[PDB]
Design a protein around this ligand. Sequence first.
Ligand SMILES: O=C1c2ccccc2-c2c1cccc2-c1nc2cnccc2[nH]1
Length: 207
Amino acid sequence: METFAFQAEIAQLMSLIINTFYSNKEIFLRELISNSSDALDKIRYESLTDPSKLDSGKELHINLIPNKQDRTLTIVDTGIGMTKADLINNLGTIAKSGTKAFMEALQAGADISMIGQFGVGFYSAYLVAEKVTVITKHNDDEQYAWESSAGGSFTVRTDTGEPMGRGTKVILHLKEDQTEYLEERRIKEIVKKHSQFIGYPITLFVE
Ligand SMILES: O=C1c2ccccc2-c2c1cccc2-c1nc2cnccc2[nH]1
């Protein structure tokens, strides 16, 4: 396991998301489903030029998996996935520029719910999660786990868990007071409100 320091801007945004009083937390799910939809659009479009890009799995879908025992909500997609260079380097560049634009928009009066317009909607996960684990597999790299509890740090390691084929899993280790996001009725309500027109099947698993 390798440990990395967040740069100052994204660290400040993570603190803002964790510390600011903001009741409309449910938008995290819309943001993660939108990210999954974008990752699925990316592999689908690349497959139109190279169909062998789907040799790692033809199915293009999004699954929402609650686990009350573990207190986790997992968003799984079979999208393009992320390489190690995406996790450490490329997304660090995006996190910096998107945070600077979002902070400029917030100081002006924008709402936390607009985070996805700045390309950093992933970070809305910290509205509900004390820790986020991202398991990912891109066709051109190995399976990796990125993880952070906001210490000013994150970790990256090769993942020895169940092999994924291709795509990303975002595991939300929920805060103690955010267990409503494990309830079937609550998840169904949020998906219907914010994500009813996503162009991939969204399966809400139950227990
Ligand atoms: O979906 C996203 C996402 C969306 C937008 C920005 C970053 C991420 C992101 C994501 C998933 C896994 C890791 C990162 C990530 N944030 C970083 C911050 N500083 C250094 C490396 C980093 N890598």
